[PDB]
Design a protein around this ligand. Structure first.
Ligand SMILES: O=C(O)C[C@H](NC(=O)Cc1c[nH]c2ccccc12)C(=O)O
Ligand SMILES: O=C(O)C[C@H](NC(=O)Cc1c[nH]c2ccccc12)C(=O)O
Ligand SMILES: *Cc1c(COP(=O)(O)O)cnc(C)c1O
Ligand SMILES: *Cc1c(COP(=O)(O)O)cnc(C)c1O
Ligand code: NA
Ligand code: NA
Lengths: 394, 268, 394, 268
């Protein structure tokens, strides 16, 4: 029994062991209460403005679109404190945890950004934060691991399974199954059991709210389409939410195509996976034919969640949003293009969204279109990866 | 069939509790696992709880995490587990056999198809670890259409509404959880369970088997004294496997000794 | 003959070879013209807002000051595009270069940030940018060098002299001596020959203007003191300018004390150097007794300019601003403290300013004081340095 | 003293231009540098322009950057340069000696003190490379109080006001710059300088010596034909040093040959 619907059509739900249901119901009730509580809202707004740096800029990219009839803006979540959009919702969830009287935070992370975000929010707000991270990811994300530690968080490598993000997701849930009376699980994307897909969208929807006000200010109308990469689905649903009822606005989600869909080495479960039940929800999953969960593959380490938020699978099924994929090489070309032509180094995650907008432009250069790409993060962190690849080439 | 009902009736006629070991099918390989299972039965197991190896067992502690890893190291698949189950049933016609599953493996290729396969091989119950009662409907319905008892976990603080639902929805036995957290042998349960047990009887729930942290004979006799119909031990059994990988013979002997002592604690 | 005074008291001037004087006079005239030109001002404001992300937040740090009567705010230049305040003035200078009809940018850099900033501004604004950087600094700033290149700039190592920032400063001037008709020299701090100290202050003064509005909004009065680190002097004069006439506001500049002033291994020429003439200006310099220019030493690579802007030497001489120093270990402790208690990783440059504010607080914990530290940049770039030191310790 | 005036008078009586080589004092060491300088004089130098090694010679191209580096490699300091200058003057009483300085070295320990030291060792002029006429006042005043000619550079596009100031402020000779950029032997000057030269004479400026890119005898005779009083060659001389570091003897012979040919080009 819940206050809010845990499903988006057939997708979502609360598939957790019975012992965790009270934790979920408590969190849902606290969230509903907080959303009507003007003091909570003012406190969240204050941190987002004076700590995180909201609102973020909406930047027009005329050098990129020159000679075409595309006008492109980038929503600058790369300028948010922490360098990625994840900061919005961890501040919100930290406040929820405090509203419930909890003093401890558990979080999982793959590429490290969610760990950094949850560690910063925890440091600012007086919470004791412990982070689970697959040991293969610890090894390849030494910088982020040290940032988490400088920020006081405990980082716990996970050696089970494939020792990457899904295994850290499992470990966070195991720990919470025993510590929910004192700890809040600060889940890192718009996925997992209700109420997380709903909370994470609502604590990211300022991205699209600001984008709408900003584009009306600058262009006097809504975008023809808003475009965002989809790892687990939070930055994209944050951009899309406020436009869902604006039926003229296309919502395009971009999953990692990796080495190419036909190779099987990709991270696009929404369009190329198979619905399953795992991590507390029913949703499309990367999985073997027998039902074992598998990893997502991308040149971008943060598009690693091997499933996708249930609201995206629902918006896709009713045809309100469209989902496509972009390969490693397309994402790399977009990363290079933005650096050279706009002086902005984008996260390789976000470069997947930009790459799809560039194809929309270049495929049909005389189509008049106003596009916004959610630039979910900055790409300082990707400089070595990009360097070494281009070195393998020249 | 009526295997659990027959069992519990028999044990009640002897004023005896059930002792039910758990192992992961195929740990540490298929042939050894079949030998382990026959040894558990010969040593006195009243029923079996059997895990199908899954990639992401998010309700299990390290011991059973590792059982799953060993089984995957041997290439064990769900289809191979179903072949094992068929052979175990062919050898042992009355002992009740319950599976411990994660949802994806049941939903994977159709929930109704999974329960129909369970019925075909002669499985008696299925506990899906990550399906709470709130999400259980298609699972319990398919179970019951195929003569499989759907088993539910009753947490030690379960409220009344939850007790009533667990009573109404489960069949075969009620899994009475000793404590929060995940499977593990080391952490013993600090909760008086007499109340949940009485309330379960009041609501005509399936007989309770206590599980989580059940690692010694005295806990078996205590569960029975508190009014439970028996107890399940898994991590403790799996640790015997883990400790004896290099000597299959000693592994079977230590399993035999442990099961024998646990089952002896359940007798009037 | 000039339009504006090239001196701040005895300090400043235009000590360049005669062949460069026309370039300076042209730049001064263009700057005076631009400052009265509302279209230039609107264009600069638009880039600072929608490209760079101004205004930046002013963050109160209550966790740091708990239990004392200090209230501390940080001006968040770490949230500016590029991660440091240098972005403000390179956008302004790029517009000046375009106003003068120039298509090429020359810039020097030490730690790399000025190179990155000048490369981004050049990429956005269609200018061909070449950067000089001492070869010792190229070797130790591989990340920044690659960012410059991804942004289209040419990076030219300088092997002369000590192969660090001063030698790159020389090389930029040599090149400009021959190419000023087509290239603008985008100098990286509030120093060098007039009119640069004046242009760079004016193109950074929004930091203090915003700080003043923000602190009046939040506290209803001006700060007791504003505190900023001093490498060459730009972030500090940007913070201080708008408060110079507010006589109650203390202006505290913090130079790098390195291993300690008495060791001689520091970067504090203003208080511990000797006035000399070099890089086009008369100002306090790190120099031998015979007059050879020497390097500044700091744990922070960006406080490397071996002199200091002439306006700072002037504000110090009349006693309107005070200048102090902070050692490597004090800066490191402040870096650790901000990470753990506020979830913000500050540049080690900026950590020198924070460290001095923390001493003001801890030395006199019951003195009532409202302080602003200019957090000139983010410290992602310093994570390895800090790690390796703490590793040398545990 | 009146060394430049005496020189120019003498050369005019012979319808001859001045040929003035530049080297950095102490490159590649003090003893060799003194030998280099005596060789330049014996080979026909009419005056000398001498650089004091400075850490940051921001008006010099690589050739002279490297001369400074070699001199610093030999530990050369300004005090040692002043000892060298004294000895050179003691050997050669009439040849005019000009220093090429950067401002910090002059201002370092007092501008007036620097000019007084120049007068004590018998230096005739000082060109401070990074002091434009706009900043020159304390420099020219101290120079003139100590009987030192302050030398100014006249850029090839100099406007009229600049020409008048260079005429009014300089003494000894006017340094007539061939081109923009920094010192170097390779880049020859593409500017007609006849006009600047005439305007300088009109304003009674000190006689013009053309410099920057002066590397061959034909440029010496061309400067004289354009109306300049002579020419200065530095990078070309310094490259002879750089090329012959391993053979001091061959270094002196090649310097002798080059200076002889350059000076021959200046004769009527
Ligand atoms: O030893 C016990 O007390 C039994 C318990 N295990 C089981 O009952 C089987 C089991 C394996 N995985 C799960 C997940 C949920 C319930 C039961 C199980 C354990 O290992 O703590
Ligand atoms: O060879 C020449 O044309 C002379 C010129 N050099 C000089 O006249 C001496 C010199 C050394 N450094 C400077 C700086 C400014 C003016 C003159 C000099 C050169 O090397 O290009
Ligand atoms: C985490 C991250 C993502 C992917 O996660 P979503 O939940 O799909 O938004 C994308 N971009 C950046 C910069 C990220 O840090
Ligand atoms: C460059 C830099 C400085 C030092 O230069 P100033 O001109 O003194 O401001 C300080 N902080 C950061 C973050 C910098 O990038
Ligand atoms: Na995904
Ligand atoms: Na300095």
């Amino acid at each position: 029994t819940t206050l809010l619907n845990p499903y988006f059509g057939e997708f979502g739900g609360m598939y957790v062991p019975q012992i965790l249901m009270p934790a979920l119901n408590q969190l849902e009730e606290a969230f509903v209460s907080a959303q009507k509580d003007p003091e909570f809202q003012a406190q969240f707004a204050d941190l987002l403005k004076n700590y995180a740096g909201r609102p973020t800029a909406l930047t027009k990219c005329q050098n990129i679109t020159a000679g075409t009839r595309t006008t492109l803006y980038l929503k600058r979540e790369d300028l948010l404190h922490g360098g990625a959009h994840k900061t919005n919702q961890v501040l919100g969830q930290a406040l929820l945890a405090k509203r419930m009287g909890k003093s401890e935070i558990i979080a999982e992370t793959g590429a490290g950004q969610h760990g950094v975000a949850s560690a910063l929010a925890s440091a600012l707000l007086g919470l004791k934060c412990r982070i689970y991270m697959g040991a293969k990811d610890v090894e390849r994300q030494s910088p982020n691991v040290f940032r988490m530690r400088l920020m006081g968080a405990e980082v716990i490598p996970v050696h089970s399974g494939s020792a990457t993000l899904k295994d850290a997701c499992n470990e966070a849930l195991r720990d919470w199954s025993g510590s929910y009376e004192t700890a809040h699980y600060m889940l890192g994307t718009a996925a997992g059991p209700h109420p997380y897909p709903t909370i994470v969208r609502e604590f990211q929807r300022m991205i699209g709210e600001e984008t709408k006000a900003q584009i009306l200010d600058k262009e006097g109308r809504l975008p023809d389409a808003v475009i965002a990469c989809v790892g687990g689905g939070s930055n994209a649903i944050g951009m899309f939410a406020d436009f869902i009822n604006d039926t003229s606005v296309g919502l395009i989600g971009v999953e990692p195509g990796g080495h190419g869909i036909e190779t099987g080495e990709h991270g696009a479960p929404l369009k190329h996976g198979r619905v399953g039940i795992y991590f507390g929800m029913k949703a499309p999953m990367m999985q073997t034919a027998d039902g074992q969960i598998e990893e997502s593959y991308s040149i971008s380490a943060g598009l690693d969640f091997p499933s996708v938020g249930p609201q995206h699978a629902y918006l896709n099924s009713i045809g309100r949003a469209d989902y496509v994929s972009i390969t490693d090489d397309e994402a790399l070309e977009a990363f290079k293009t933005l650096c050279r032509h706009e002086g902005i180094i984008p996260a390789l995650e976000s470069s997947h969204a930009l790459a799809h907008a560039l194809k929309m432009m270049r495929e049909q250069p005389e189509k008049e279109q106003l596009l916004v790409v959610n630039l979910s993060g900055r790409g300082d962190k990707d400089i070595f990866t990009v360097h070494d690849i281009l070195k393998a080439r020249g | 069939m009526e295997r659990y009902e027959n069992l519990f009736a028999q044990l009640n006629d002897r004023r005896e509790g059930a002792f039910v070991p758990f192992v992961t099918l195929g740990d540490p390989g298929i042939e050894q696992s079949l030998k382990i299972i026959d040894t558990l039965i010969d040593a006195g197991a009243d029923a079996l709880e059997l895990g199908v190896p899954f990639s992401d067992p998010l309700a299990d502690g390290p011991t059973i995490q590792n059982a799953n890893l060993r089984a995957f190291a041997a290439g064990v698949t769900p289809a191979q587990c179903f072949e094992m189950l068929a052979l175990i049933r062919e050898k042992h016609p009355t002992i009740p056999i319950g599976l411990l599953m994660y949802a994806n493996l049941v939903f994977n290729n159709g929930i109704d198809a999974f329960y129909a396969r369970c019925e075909q091989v002669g499985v008696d119950s299925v506990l899906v670890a990550d399906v709470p009662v709130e999400e259980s409907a298609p699972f319990r319905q398919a179970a019951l259409r195929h003569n499989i008892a759907p088993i539910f976990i009753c947490p030690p603080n379960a409220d009344d509404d939850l007790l009533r639902q667990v009573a109404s929805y489960g069949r075969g036995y009620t899994y009475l959880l000793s404590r929060s957290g995940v499977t593990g042998a080391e952490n013993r349960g600090a909760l008086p369970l007499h109340h949940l047990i009485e309330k379960l009887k009041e609501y005509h729930a399936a007989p309770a088997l206590q599980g989580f942290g059940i690692s010694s004979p005295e806990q078996v006799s205590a569960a029975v004294r508190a009014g439970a119909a028996g107890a399940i031990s898994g991590s403790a059994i799996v640790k015997i496997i883990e400790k004896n990988l290099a000597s299959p013979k000693q592994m079977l002997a230590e399993l035999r000794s442990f099961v024998s002592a646990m089952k002896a604690a359940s007798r009037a």
